[PDB]
Amino acid sequence: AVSNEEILQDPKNPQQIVTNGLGVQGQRYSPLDLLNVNNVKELRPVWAFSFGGQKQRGQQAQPLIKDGVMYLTGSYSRVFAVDARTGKKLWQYDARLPDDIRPCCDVINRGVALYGNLVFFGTLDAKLVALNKDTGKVVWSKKVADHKEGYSISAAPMIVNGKLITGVAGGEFGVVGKIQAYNPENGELLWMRPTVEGHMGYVYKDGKAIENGISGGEAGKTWPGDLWKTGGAAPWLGGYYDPETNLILFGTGNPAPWNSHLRPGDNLYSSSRLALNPDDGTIKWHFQSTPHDGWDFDGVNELISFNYKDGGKEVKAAATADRNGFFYVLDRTNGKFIRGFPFVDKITWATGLDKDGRPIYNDASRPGAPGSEAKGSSVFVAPAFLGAKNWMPMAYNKDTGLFYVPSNEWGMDIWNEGIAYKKGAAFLGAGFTIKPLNEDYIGVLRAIDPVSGKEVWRHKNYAPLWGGVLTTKGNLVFTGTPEGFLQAFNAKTGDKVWEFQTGSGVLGSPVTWEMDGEQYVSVVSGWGGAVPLWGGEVAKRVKDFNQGGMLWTFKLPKQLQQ
Ligand SMILES: O=C(O)c1cc(C(=O)O)c2c(n1)C(=O)C(=O)c1cc(C(=O)O)[nH]c1-2
Numbered sequence: 433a434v435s436n437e438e439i440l441q442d443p444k445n446p447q448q449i450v451t452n453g454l455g456v457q458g459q460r461y462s463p464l465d466l467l468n469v470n471n472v473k474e475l476r477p478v479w480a481f482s483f484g485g486q487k488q489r490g491q492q493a494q495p496l497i498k499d500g501v502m503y504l505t506g507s508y509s510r511v512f513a514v515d516a517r518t519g520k521k522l523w524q525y526d527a528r529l530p531d532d533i534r535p536c537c538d539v540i541n542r543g544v545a546l547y548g549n550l551v552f553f554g555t556l557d558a559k560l561v562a563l564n565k566d567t568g569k570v571v572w573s574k575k576v577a578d579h580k581e582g583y584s585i586s587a588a589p590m591i592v593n594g595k596l597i598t599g600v601a602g603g604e605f606g607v608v609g610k611i612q613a614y615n616p617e618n619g620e621l622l623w624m625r626p627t628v629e630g631h632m633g634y635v636y637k638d639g640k641a642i643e644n645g646i647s648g649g650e651a652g653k654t655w656p657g658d659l660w661k662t663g664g665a666a667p668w669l670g671g672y673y674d675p676e677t678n679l680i681l682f683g684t685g686n687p688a689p690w691n692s693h694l695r696p697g698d699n700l701y702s703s704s705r706l707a708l709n710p711d712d713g714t715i716k717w718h719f720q721s722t723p724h725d726g727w728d729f730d731g732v733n734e735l736i737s738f739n740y741k742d743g744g745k746e747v748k749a750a751a752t753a754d755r756n757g758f759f760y761v762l763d764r765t766n767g768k769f770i771r772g773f774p775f776v777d778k779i780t781w782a783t784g785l786d787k788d789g790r791p792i793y794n795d796a797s798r799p800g801a802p803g804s805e806a807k808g809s810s811v812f813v814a815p816a817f818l819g820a821k822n823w824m825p826m827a828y829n830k831d832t833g834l835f836y837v838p839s840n841e842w843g844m845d846i847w848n849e850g851i852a853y854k855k856g857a858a859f860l861g862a863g864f865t866i867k868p869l870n871e872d873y874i875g876v877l878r879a880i881d882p883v884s885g886k887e888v889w890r891h892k893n894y895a896p897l898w899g900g901v902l903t904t905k906g907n908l909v910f911t912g913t914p915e916g917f918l919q920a921f922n923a924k925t926g927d928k929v930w931e932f933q934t935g936s937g938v939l940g941s942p943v944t945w946e947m948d949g950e951q952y953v954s955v956v957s958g959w960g961g962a963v964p965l966w967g968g969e970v971a972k973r974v975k976d977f978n979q980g981g982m983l984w985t986f987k988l989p990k991q992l993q994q
């Protein structure tokens with residue numbers, strides 16, 4: 433019972449959230465203001481739901497809520513339907529996963545999509561699955577790609593113009609990134625668009641694949657030899673959609689392998705934002721945040737549409753806080769650079785951006801080629817490869833006009849080494865040790881003014897931040913910490929105003945909605961993601977943080993709202 437018009441209305445309908453991002457553009461802003469700075473002290477848990485299964489690790493889903501039912505995912509490719517008022521389980525789906533799944537960075541999943549009477553998600557063995565919303569039974573399932581080649585799916589899918597769209601993950605395994613659209617009712621493939629230059633995209637008619645242009649025009653333009661055949665650029669975070677331009681905005685992963693000396697050239701369209709026509713999957717513009725990446729600065733971070741006025745002129749902008757440390761503002765009609773500026777305190781790999789938004793590189797900050805030695809020169813780089821920001825989404829508050837960015841301050845030793853591609857094996861060619869830049873903190877929640885290019889406030893956290901952000905009309909900003917708290921801040925000042933210890937690190941993007949005249953807030957908890965196994969010295973800071981796997985639901989009682 434979810435229509436396309438309903439999806440386009442988010443977040444206008446107080447009783448439901450039927451999109452990842454609280455609206456197709458991903459602003460993560462709720463217009464609800466029952467809960468505000470003056471009464472958030474009365475917010476308290478009303479029920480919780482354990483995922484069980486002795487299957488914990490990272491829990492990254494944002495729940496969707498429709499007809500009083502919450503739909504969410506868990507680690508290890510599970511889907512739950514849970515009564516929003518009581519926490520009672522309606523049904524649960526556990527995907528059968530093979531023992532040789534190949535996620536780089538934990539067995540995470542970022543959520544479902546809803547359309548008609550179906551619930552959709554992608555699995556860690558790279559299937560797209562449609563479940564009956566009432567029974568949880570499989571209605572259809574399609575292989576998106578071959579998990580034995582290193583493909584997985586970790587992102588929430590999206591609905592655009594009645595089409596179900598998913599990317600894939602696996603750049604650390606040298607997969608070929610691609611975005612796919614499907615008929616939601618039956619799983620019939622509609623189009624496919626590779627994100628690596630040189631690969632043919634297709635539309636599908638009557639079950640037949642019809643050529644629809646090579647991504648980037650021709651193979652070998654910004655890649656040498658056949659390196660583009662394992663180029664990565666996986667669009668592993670999903671994307672968002674702008675109704676005004678009718679463009680899907682999708683970011684792409686790092687180029688493979690990590691050893692950039694094996695792939696001279698800009699390596700399109702790795703570490704880029706793409707705008708695609710949803711009719712047929714053609715790329716209408718691109719912006720490359722890190723050309724010829726040498727640091728695993730994936731360019732997937734969400735590109736969030738927002739409008740403002742400059743010289744009395746209306747600007748259709750979009751903002752993204754990149755892995756590489758720069759906060760970019762683009763003209764979303766054509767992809768042209770408006771402004772870009774650091775949102776972390778230390779960047780070594782570039783000294784700035786040129787007039788088109790291309791980095792001005794500091795070549796001493798790229799690890800050298802191994803040459804005659806086993807390893808090349810080690811260099812210290814900031815940000816670390818895990819990024820100034822990683823998967824976890826920022827939020828836009830329409831009232832303050834600010835973006836609220838969960839950022840991290842860390843650097844890395846990094847070196848390069850030879851690497852031969854082997855199907856299904858890691859495809860790095862680099863070694864590394866992530867290190868803190870500061871003794872007392874790593875994570876920094878930052879309010880960014882995207883028009884002035886200024887930081888408005890900052891809040892430091894001992895552990896890295898690794899969770900999505902929510903902001904509301906009640907002048908509130910919510911986000912989780914690995915220390916286990918769901919935390920709320922004053923959106924104007926950054927002062928903490930509320931928190932609750934959920935008992936395991938909180939990664940989920942919080943969501944809020946209204947039922948029976950009361951405002952609810954929900955988040956999933958369960959520590960994991962890339963930091964424990966990729967985090968180097970910083971992982972040691974959080975080594976004693978226990979796993980979990982639980983949906984938490986809070987409410988402001990009606991009689992305490994005034
Ligand atoms: O290049 C890729 O295809 C890909 C996928 C993922 C993923 O699917 O989650 C991550 C990364 N890269 C990555 O570079 C990274 O730091 C990362 C962190 C996480 C996480 O969920 O904590 N996933 C990923």
Ligand SMILES: [Pr+3]
Pocket residue numbers: 603604685686728730
């Ligand atoms: Pr990557």
